[PDB]
């Protein structure tokens, strides 16, 4: 929102599946959110390196605006 992407922090470590197009992440890591609602308990995001993928939204927390 407001000329900037949405962001999230990781709450627990995760590892992607190759046939599911998920994104591997570590606890406390910050990622940009690309899609906060995809169905099935997930969200779309990208890490610092520039990889994208699906992540379980119960493993992460959406960060505040105007920060």
């Amino acid at each position: 929102g407001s000329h900037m992407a949405t962001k999230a922090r990781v709450m627990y470590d995760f590892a992607a599946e190759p046939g599911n197009n998920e994104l591997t992440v570590n606890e406390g890591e910050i990622i940009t959110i690309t899609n906060p609602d995809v169905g099935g308990g997930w969200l779309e995001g990208r890490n610092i390196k520039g990889e994208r993928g699906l992540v379980p939204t119960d493993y992460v927390e959406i960060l505040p605006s105007d920060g």
Partner: peptide, 23 residues
């Protein structure tokens, strides 16, 4: 879609919660 979609429901999570939050 013309965007990324989950092939399965989300896995279970190791949240510390004997009982879930009221909020």
């Amino acid at each position: 879609a013309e965007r990324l979609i989950p092939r399965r429901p989300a896995p279970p999570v190791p949240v510390p919660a004997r009982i879930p939050s009221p909020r």
